[PDB]
């Protein structure tokens, strides 16, 4: 080993200093700083083609100390495997390193996600799904370990990006952005991430919210002037206006996912239009008419009933239908985020409530004084 460093003092430019540091440490038994700077050096070469050999050096290191957050070991192993350009060798290496680090936890999950990522590039059904589903219970009452959860939810987002299950992608990508609470990432990355999450929302089967997404205070902020069309269509979705959506068909028409998916988007906009009308009409009336549905959703009266039937079935609004009178009673509408104006209306309603309550508490006490003194 000491000869290995001494001869390899000139592996790369500027490296002799890093080789000297590594040698000092090996001569000083300081394995933690050695590990931190192994993570430091390992990054420095733009190619690190000697990493396939240094891993033998790291393999020599991980025997006396063989700890120092073996999660760091899994990470350096991953950065090396990125160099190894053959599948089978890398997969075997990852397996045997996993068995090596079986006694840390929160590192074995990194190994498993690397393992699955490799085979994400070839064949999915047999293993990928199996890999993820197997590793799920360890994520148990042990939060703040974004160090591994970021990689977790990247892999999940990627795998579910395939097949077509967009909704699970939306969920996992929201959760991914979340676990990395801090952005500190390149602009183009978050820009593409914003684009993909927006499209997933517009295609997810069981995600009709589009209200928390639009104001997602970290993603939508970086598309206002590049592919605005996405923000425009998302606002159209939040506002439940068939008319504005259709009028913007010119915009989304280019994108293939939204090109193929027309019926889905139309039905989603229509459901959100119904929800808007159930949220706009005052609580006292809240009794729509078929004709108004047909005029605000761009559907014929005959096919309106199925729309509301479905809306109820999914769980957006509870109520009934009056086919005889062609009306519909909406006893409740799904909760929706409110800005800082409707907040004031709700507060004023609460003031009215408090005033009423005090008035009639006083009435009771006064009229009932003599008995209850």
């Amino acid at each position: 080993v000491p000869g290995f460093l001494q001869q390899s003092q000139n592996s790369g430019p500027g490296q002799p200093a890093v080789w000297h540091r590594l040698e000092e440490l090996y001569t000083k038994k300081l394995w933690h700083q050695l590990t931190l700077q192994v993570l430091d050096f390992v990054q420095d070469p733009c190619f690190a083609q000697g990493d396939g050999l240094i891993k033998l050096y790291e393999n020599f290191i991980s025997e006396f100390e063989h700890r120092v957050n073996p999660l760091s070991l899994v990470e350096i192993i991953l950065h090396v495997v990125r160099q190894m350009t053959d599948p089978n060798v890398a997969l075997t290496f990852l397996e045997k390193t996993r068995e090596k680090v079986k006694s840390s936890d929160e590192a074995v999950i990194l190994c498993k996600t690397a393992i699955g990522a490799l085979k994400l590039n070839i064949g999915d059904l047999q293993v990928t799904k199996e890999t993820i589903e197997d590793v799920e219970e360890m994520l148990n009452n042990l939060p703040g370990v974004t160090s591994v959860h970021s990689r977790f939810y990247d892999l999940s987002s990627k795998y579910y990006q395939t097949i077509g299950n967009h909704a699970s992608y939306y969920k996992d990508a929201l959760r991914f952005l979340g676990c990395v609470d801090i952005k500190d990432l390149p602009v183009s990355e978050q820009q593409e991430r914003a684009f993909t999450l927006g499209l997933a929302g517009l295609l997810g089967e069981g995600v009709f919210n589009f209200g928390e997404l639009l104001m997602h205070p970290v993603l939508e902020s970086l598309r206002n002037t590049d592919r605005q069309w996405l923000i425009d269509t998302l606002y159209a979705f939040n506002s439940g206006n068939v008319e504005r959506f259709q009028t913007l068909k010119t915009a989304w028409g280019q994108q293939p996912d939204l090109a193929a998916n027309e019926a889905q988007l139309l039905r989603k906009i229509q459901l959100l239009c119904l929800m808007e009308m159930t949220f706009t009409r005052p609580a006292n009336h809240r009794q729509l008419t078929f004709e108004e549905i047909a005029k605000s959703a761009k559907i014929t009266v005959n096919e309106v009933e199925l729309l509301v039937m479905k809306a109820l079935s999914v769980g957006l609004v509870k109520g009934s239908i009056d086919e005889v009178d062609k009306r519909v009673h909406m006893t409740w509408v799904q909760p929706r985020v409110l800005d800082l104006q409707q907040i004031k209306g709700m507060k004023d309603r609460l003031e009215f409530w408090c005033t009423d309550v005090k008035s009639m508490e006083m009435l009771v006490e006064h009229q009932a004084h003599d008995i209850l003194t």
Binding site: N141, P143, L174, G178, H216, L372
Partner: protein, 65 residues
Amino acid sequence: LGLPTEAYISVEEVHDDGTPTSKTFEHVTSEIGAEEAEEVGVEHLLRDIKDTTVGTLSQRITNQV
């Protein structure tokens, strides 16, 4: 004007957007109960104020107001 105790049980909370899973307290119903010995002792000590009037007076002071 209310009970003197509050009970709380720690549970994991998973969010739709709040993402990280922390542990939050969920309130659980609580009340006050006594065995015959405790009831005897307390009723004895409660000779500082007492108004039973189980009739309408109680069901209108203990409530409504």
